[PDB]
Amino acid sequence: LRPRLCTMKKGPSGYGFNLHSDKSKPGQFIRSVDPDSPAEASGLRAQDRIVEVNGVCMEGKQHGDVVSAIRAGGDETKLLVVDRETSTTL
């Protein structure tokens, strides 16, 4: 599965997701997505990692800097996200 774009327009309750850091892995991940939210409708899923915000790479950025990038876009955001890697050599 490859990176997917989730495009959403903000409602009165925001987009409807929680963004958080991981214990082990770098990057900002989707903790949860609210039912019936703009976020859910856009295809965003729990455990997704944010790769880009509005076409800008988020690699190496701290949590607050990804949050600011999302907020800076005003009433809309476009998140390029990927699910967690599921490939292991044994």
Side-chain angles (χ1 to χ4, degrees):
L1 179 59
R2 283 174 184 101
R4 53 204 220 275
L5 195 68
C6 299
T7 298
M8 55 189 94
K9 289 205 184 305
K10 222 199 310 185
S13 297
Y15 294 112
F17 69 91
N18 181 277
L19 188 68
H20 81 307
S21 298
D22 185 78
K23 173 183 171 161
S24 311
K25 302 298 179 187
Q28 298 305 306
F29 297 81
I30 307 306
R31 190 167 209 229
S32 58
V33 177
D34 293 345
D36 209 25
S37 63
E40 179 183 70
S42 79
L44 197 70
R45 309 194 289 243
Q47 299 181 333
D48 281 343
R49 179 172 61 89
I50 299 184
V51 182
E52 304 188 345
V53 173
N54 302 326
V56 179
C57 185
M58 294 291 106
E59 179 174 346
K61 289 191 186 297
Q62 297 299 295
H63 176 86
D65 295 326
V66 181
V67 171
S68 74
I70 296 169
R71 289 180 174 157
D75 291 333
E76 182 179 5
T77 201
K78 301 185 186 74
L79 305 181
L80 190 72
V81 301
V82 298
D83 44 8
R84 294 188 179 268
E85 183 66 12
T86 55
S87 180
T88 300
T89 298
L90 295 172

